[PDB]
Design a binder for this molecule. Structure first.
Ligand SMILES: NC(=O)c1ccc[n+]([C@@H]2O[C@H](COP(=O)([O-])OP(=O)(O)OC[C@H]3O[C@@H](n4cnc5c(N)ncnc54)[C@H](OP(=O)(O)O)[C@@H]3O)[C@@H](O)[C@H]2O)c1
Ligand SMILES: CC(C)Cc1ccc([C@@H](C)C(=O)O)cc1
Length: 303
């Protein structure tokens, strides 16, 4: 099903994550996005950074052309990369993503991160970036607009902006049982802003940003025990946990079996005791933990 966003548009609560590192041929994103839509995904998360918008857009267009879905049935997200925060660059970056995907509009456009980069760090007033985002929704380039990787204080900066026209509909952030974002999630709920979780399956553990020593979420003993109790899988437990918290959850998979397994999240439910057990795993662990983020003046986890 879908959640109703604070601008009246609807967002499907399970989304397909499309990122794969450069060693995976670009052609795979086309193939797996098609398999995701076939499996029943209707929300597809991409970004300029991911270098796959051509393939992902072609996958969406391919499934429209063969009669499987209509454009209105698909919720596509792209994101404004941090070198394009200066307000005059926002609409051209979005138009560029739309040209790559060959789509007339995105369902959702996010500021990918609060950490501005030289168009080397940059200093930009993100309220002016936001005004530029509001103009893209007014022009019909984006049905909805939101943010990503914002903390509470950064989110309040927007919410408190003089003459705000549109609240962010969502804040897409790292969120899983080792870093469950409870207090942020409560704040977002108090504002009717949806929290969308990425790395909900514990991340792709990419050596560029993730310490290989970090705990492997899907081997967690509590998640494994819950998967045995429910005769599901640790991944399904981890996705279902998000849905029952009122969090919209992404799941990346480039594997045909796991793509189809992931939509099973709608087929069972966790009890209050199960949810408390998963809540007990929280350990302030963000898998993305790299000098290249942590030294930035607007790093969100500076807390
Ligand atoms: N906003 C941001 O800054 C940001 C940052 C990170 C990610 N994201 C978005 O969120 C998406 C998902 O996050 P993520 O890329 O960190 O990955 P994820 O959803 O945490 O998945 C991690 C790994 O889980 C594996 N997996 C998937 N389904 C499984 C299953 N049923 N059983 C066992 N393993 C399973 C996948 O491997 P296989 O491919 O081998 O199945 C995947 O590499 C990204 O693709 C991107 O769209 C956004
Ligand atoms: C505070 C930082 C850690 C947030 C952040 C995480 C991942 C990304 C890119 C690499 C992505 O994969 O979408 C961008 C920003």
């Amino acid at each position: 099903q879908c959640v109703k966003l604070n601008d009246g548009h609807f967002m499907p609560v399970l989304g397909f994550g499309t990122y794969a590192p450069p060693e995976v041929p670009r052609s795979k994103a086309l193939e797996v996005t098609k398999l995701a839509i076939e499996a029943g995904f209707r929300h597809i998360d991409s970004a300029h950074l991911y270098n796959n918008e051509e393939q992902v857009g072609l996958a969406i267009r391919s499934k429209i052309a063969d009669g499987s879905v209509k454009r209105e049935d698909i919720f596509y997200t792209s994101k404004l990369w941090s070198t394009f925060h200066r307000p005059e660059l926002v609409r051209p970056a979005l138009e560029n993503s739309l040209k790559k995907a060959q789509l007339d509009y995105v369902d959702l456009y996010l500021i990918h991160s609060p950490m501005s980069l030289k168009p080397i760090f940059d200093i930009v007033d993100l309220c002016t970036t936001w005004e530029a985002m509001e103009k893209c929704k007014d022009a019909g380039l984006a049905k909805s607009i939101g943010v990503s990787n914002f903390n509470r204080r950064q989110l309040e900066m927007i919410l408190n902006k003089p003459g705000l026209k549109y609240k962010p509909v969502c804040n897409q952030v790292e969120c899983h049982p080792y870093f469950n974002r409870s207090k942020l999630l409560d704040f977002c709920k108090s504002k009717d802003i949806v929290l969308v979780a990425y790395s909900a399956l514990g991340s792709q553990r990419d050596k560029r940003w993730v310490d290989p020593n970090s705990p492997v979420l899907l081997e967690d003993p509590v998640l494994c025990a819950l998967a045995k109790k429910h005769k599901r899988t640790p991944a399904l437990i981890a996705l279902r946990y998000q849905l029952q918290r009122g969090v919209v959850v992404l799941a990346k998979s480039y594997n045909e079996q796991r793509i189809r397994q992931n939509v099973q999240v709608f087929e069972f439910q966790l009890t209050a005791e199960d949810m408390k057990a998963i809540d007990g795993l929280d350990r302030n662990l963000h898998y993305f933990n790299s000098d290249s983020f942590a030294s930035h003046p607007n790093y969100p986890y500076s807390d």
